[PDB]
């Protein structure tokens, strides 16, 4: 019986491939063929944030657009003041094998996790004056690959055991488990209203989830290698995806396919990070060729490079007001561009 | 830094940078060793001194005023490619092989680790455990069962030396050395064998840092 039903699954996949074929009226390239280009985006390094000893794996901005956390494998989590380069806090971690970090949108909490399969929540406003661990969420079976706050009581974590999870920080238990990827989930990105989120995995697949429901709504399959980076468009109706085959792609949640492809023949190394500018006209992508490229997100031109790092650009981020871009890297420095 | 509160904030920032450097000095005098055995070999048993810290397990000991840190990642059953760059900066890899089904699996693992793009310049210490159990089952079960191209007389002196050649033939890089030592698994000698081999890595690292080969 199991062969006959997957035989029906083979034609049921043919239906959704034909519905994607039926909706393909015109390319996004020929629709945007007449609008003016962005020109040439030249940014300069404003700050350089020195003080990490080992290499930097993650950074996240605060919603006030001034403070930022960075994680590194010397075992320290450092909160920076980006305007003055001051170190506000330095949090010594238990396990120095950290791969992700997050800022709460309130500003009171900071999360981190990695090869210990634990998402630790740190309280910043203590009334004793020191940063301490408020909860360490332990239910994943693989390494923690990403974590994002919904509010101060809910966090969504990605993991390498092919599973995303929704937690309750008050009680410290999983609320909703998101299964369906066959490879390790390497990244996730929240929708601006935080009702959906996308997650890209090692089986070259992206999946659109539903937070209060718990189901997979859409599956997007265009890449040929492992997806490392994902980011939502600012209005929440598209997302961008960067993978190891040196390609970014723009998918859209309403037409259920890919729109544009961002690739160059000189580019042979994989994307580590992507983010969008505040209008969604630029797409910044961090690479293993040690620099970042700015892509015209609507015409797929490459307009600008951010080349200042001696090693691989591991993380990347744009502020909420849209002023600065911070890129961290394996040469143990963060920079800020404008 | 003009304000009275901007002065005291900058004084706090400088106090953090000093404590960050005092931690980077204490941690740089550490030897980090990555344990990469296959399944159950001898990796969790070669750690003579047990001072621990499912995730990642770290055991540490000190030997001749030198502090060793051993990172087992056997419980990380994920895709190995994703977290292998975390250990790019270790001194050596300690590979354990059980000589007593898991033989060609251990070789294909060793081919992946030795030819990794992060593990060129990273030398390997190859232990070969349980030679006290390899010594008698070779009398009952010859090496032509698993290695069919073995053309030797089925002697423990050269069956163990032929298997050692099968691992060292995967090297394919001159910038890294494979040290090798057949552990009896009843030996209080693995602390010294690691210590003698780590010294030869540090000398050859210093010859590379002084521009002298």
């Amino acid at each position, epitope marked *: 019986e199991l062969d006959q039903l997957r035989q029906e699954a083979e034609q049921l996949k043919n239906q959704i491939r034909d519905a994607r074929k039926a909706c393909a009226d015109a390319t996004l390239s020929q629709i945007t063929n007449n609008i003016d280009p962005v020109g040439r985006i030249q940014m300069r390094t404003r700050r350089t944030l020195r003080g990490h000893l080992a290499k930097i794996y993650a950074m996240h901005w605060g919603t006030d657009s001034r403070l930022l956390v960075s994680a590194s494998q010397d075992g320290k989590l450092i909160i920076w003041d980006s305007y003055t380069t001051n170190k506000v806090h330095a949090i010594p971690l238990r396990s120095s094998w950290v791969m992700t970090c997050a800022y709460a949108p309130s500003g009171n909490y900071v999360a981190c996790g990695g090869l210990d399969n634990i998402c630790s929540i740190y309280n910043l*406003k203590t009334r*004793e*004056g020191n940063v301490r661990v408020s909860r360490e969420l332990a239910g994943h079976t693989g390494y923690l690959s990403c974590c994002r706050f919904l509010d101060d009581n809910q966090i969504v974590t990605s993991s390498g055991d092919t599973t995303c999870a929704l937690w309750d920080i008050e009680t410290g238990q999983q609320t909703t488990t998101f299964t369906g990827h066959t490879g390790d989930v390497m990244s996730l990105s929240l929708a601006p209203d935080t009702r959906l989120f996308v997650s890209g995995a090692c089986d070259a697949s992206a999946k659109l989830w539903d937070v209060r429901e718990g189901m997979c709504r859409q599956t997007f399959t265009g890449h040929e290698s492992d997806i490392n980076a994902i980011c939502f468009f600012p209005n929440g109706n598209a997302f961008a995806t960067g993978s190891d085959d040196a390609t970014c792609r723009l998918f859209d949640l309403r037409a259920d396919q890919e729109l544009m492809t961002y690739s160059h023949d000189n580019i042979i190394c994989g994307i580590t990070s992507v983010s969008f500018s505040k209008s969604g006209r630029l797409l910044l992508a961090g690479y293993d060729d040690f620099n970042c490229n700015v892509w015209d997100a609507l015409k797929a031109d490459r307009a600008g490079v951010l080349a200042g790092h001696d090693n691989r650009v591991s993380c990347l981020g744009v502020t909420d007001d849209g002023m600065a871009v911070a890129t961290g890297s394996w040469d143990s420095f963060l920079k800020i561009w404008n | 830094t*003009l*304000s*009275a509160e901007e002065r*005291a*904030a900058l004084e*706090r920032s400088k106090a953090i940078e000093k404590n960050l450097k005092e931690d980077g000095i204490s941690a740089a005098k550490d030897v980090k060793l990555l344990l990469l055995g296959a399944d159950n070999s001898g990796k969790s048993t070669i750690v003579k001194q047990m001072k621990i810290i499912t995730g990642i397990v770290e055991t540490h000991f000190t030997f001749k005023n030198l502090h060793f840190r051993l990172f087992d990642v056997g419980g990380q059953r994920s895709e190995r490619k994703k977290w292998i760059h975390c250990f790019e900066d270790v001194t050596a890899i300690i590979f354990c092989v059980d000589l007593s089904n898991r033989m060609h699996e251990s070789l294909m693992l060793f081919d992946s680790i030795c030819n990794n793009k992060f593990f060129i310049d990273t030398s390997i210490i190859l232990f070969l455990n349980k030679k006290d159990l390899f010594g008698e089952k070779i009398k009952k079960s010859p090496l032509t069962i698993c290695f069919p191209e073995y053309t030797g007389p089925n002697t423990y002196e050269d069956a163990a030396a032929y298997i050692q050649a099968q691992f060292e033939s995967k090297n394919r890089s001159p910038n890294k050395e494979i040290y090798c030592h057949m552990t009896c698994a009843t030996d209080t000698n693995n602390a010294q064998v690691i210590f003698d081999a780590v010294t030869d890595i540090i000398i050859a690292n210093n010859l590379r840092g002084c521009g002298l080969y």
Partner: single-chain antibody
Amino acid sequence: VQLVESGGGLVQPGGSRKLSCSASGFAFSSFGMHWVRQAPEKGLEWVAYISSGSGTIYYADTVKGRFTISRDDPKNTLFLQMTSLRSEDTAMYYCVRSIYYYGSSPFDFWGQGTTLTVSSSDIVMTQATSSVPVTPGESVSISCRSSKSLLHSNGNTYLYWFLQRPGQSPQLLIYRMSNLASGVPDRFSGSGSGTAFTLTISRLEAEDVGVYYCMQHLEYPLTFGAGTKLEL
């Protein structure tokens, strides 16, 4: 979190006395500490300051030369060595903690007081009103005025508000001219202009009766305002 001070009593003038302040319940090594005294019927008056790690020490110019502040981070104590005691040093001395980074709340916990009884270029903060007759439920507005603009080029206006209930130590209400402190209700509010500042209470309750001070933190020495008392 608590601070408890000891070592106050009747002292002959010209002599000496040591004041101790032992801290319990917080990471004492990362807070800077202040001494603030209160004359037997007058308002608050800043005395000394030691930072975290003792790398910065300031004194009031009244006591510069004859008082010495010091801290013991292994024992979690604070010291004020007082020499050449005049009869103007009869006061009640408060031990205040304050931590400084971006977005913090300085001057947020105050000690209990020691009664020391000696035998017998600055910025001036002006609270010209000194007494208002107040009824509960009504709307109060306390106004403070400065002889220099407390607004800085960074954007902050370093003006703080404190409330001292009858028989208690002061307590921070508003920090940096608009920020409501943690633990105080939402009915307090602060507005400013750079030179004139206002504290508005929306509806009065019985837990708001006391003396209201304004402080500046733009530059040292820190100068309080005179007391604006609220009564029934």
